[PDB]
Amino acid sequence: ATVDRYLRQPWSVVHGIPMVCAFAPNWERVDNFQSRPEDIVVATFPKSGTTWVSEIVDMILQGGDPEKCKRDAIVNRVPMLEFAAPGEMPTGSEVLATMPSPRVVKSHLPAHILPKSFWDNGCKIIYVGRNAKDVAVSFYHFDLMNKFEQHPGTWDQYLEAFMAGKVAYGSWFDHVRGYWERRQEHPILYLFYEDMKEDLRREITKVAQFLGQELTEVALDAIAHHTSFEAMRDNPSTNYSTVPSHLMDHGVSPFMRKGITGDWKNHFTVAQNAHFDQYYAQKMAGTDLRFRTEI
Ligand SMILES: Nc1ncnc2c1ncn2[C@@H]1O[C@H](COP(=O)(O)O)[C@@H](OP(=O)(O)O)[C@H]1O
Ligand SMILES: O=[N+]([O-])c1ccc(O)cc1
């Protein structure tokens, strides 16, 4: 009721970055967020594998036992730093204040507005990047179903906004390059969604090592089995089916939508693809960061 006036509103702006309308009021709760050195941040541009990696991390911290990951939904096990639903739920920052170390913190904030406390405390950041074409498709369908978002209109107009960095959380180009460069002065494990599709066990192993956790072969296989797309799609703890329909209309588009690399080929027109490829090449010249659009 009270949150309704924030839903389906145009983006607000915080520190020059487009922001979900409901999340933007009382930004100081974010700017002044009190982190701990043991915090683990799962940071992504939206729709790049946040939930996937969050479940992997929580599974690793539970020793590979899926029962401890079924006791609550992932939205509560891994709170989103900047989440807010004024008048209906506590903010993510308030929920995190009460959680025991090691806290797992999800965020989509670009590196330059991630709260300074994280950088000062050297907090381990696991960043996940995904190729921009698949991200755009996933984010468009997410905005169709998620009522916190401004309505995206048609796909062609959404794609123009995406390429120009007008969507919530800003420019994908700036986001992925910012955390790629920031690893110079901070402990960051920079993962690729496409690598995880190619060889999930290889990436789980890298996450475990970054976190200092040793996995038996049995625990590694258990985590890989429980973090397949099919498993996470059918798991009520990870598939977001417990979110009220007035916030996420799962009938419009499910959260666990397709889970592949290359769905952009089913949405980009021949013209859109050529135009996107030409712009992307200009915007990504001068970084060594590279993404795969097919595996
Ligand atoms: N175990 C998994 N394996 C492969 N893809 C997964 C996955 N879990 C979620 N995904 C996909 O990651 C996207 C959600 O990303 P995020 O958690 O950052 O919001 C969605 O992509 P699609 O819309 O392309 O299906 C979701 O289907
Ligand atoms: O991950 N999330 O829950 C999100 C991501 C993007 C957004 O605009 C709102 C919510």
From TrEMBL:
<comment type="similarity">
    <text>Belongs to the sulfotransferase 1 family.</text>
</comment>
<protein>
    <recommendedName>
        <fullName>Sulfotransferase</fullName>
        <ecNumber>2.8.2.-</ecNumber>
    </recommendedName>
</protein>
<dbReference type="GO" id="GO:0008146">
    <property type="term" value="F:sulfotransferase activity"/>
</dbReference>
<dbReference type="InterPro" id="IPR000863">
    <property type="entry name" value="Sulfotransferase_dom"/>
</dbReference>
<keyword id="KW-0808">Transferase</keyword>
<dbReference type="GO" id="GO:0005737">
    <property type="term" value="C:cytoplasm"/>
</dbReference>
<dbReference type="InterPro" id="IPR027417">
    <property type="entry name" value="P-loop_NTPase"/>
</dbReference>
<dbReference type="Pfam" id="PF00685">
    <property type="entry name" value="Sulfotransfer_1"/>
</dbReference>
<feature type="domain" description="Sulfotransferase">
    <location>
        <begin position="37"/>
        <end position="287"/>
    </location>
</feature>
<keyword id="KW-0963">Cytoplasm</keyword>
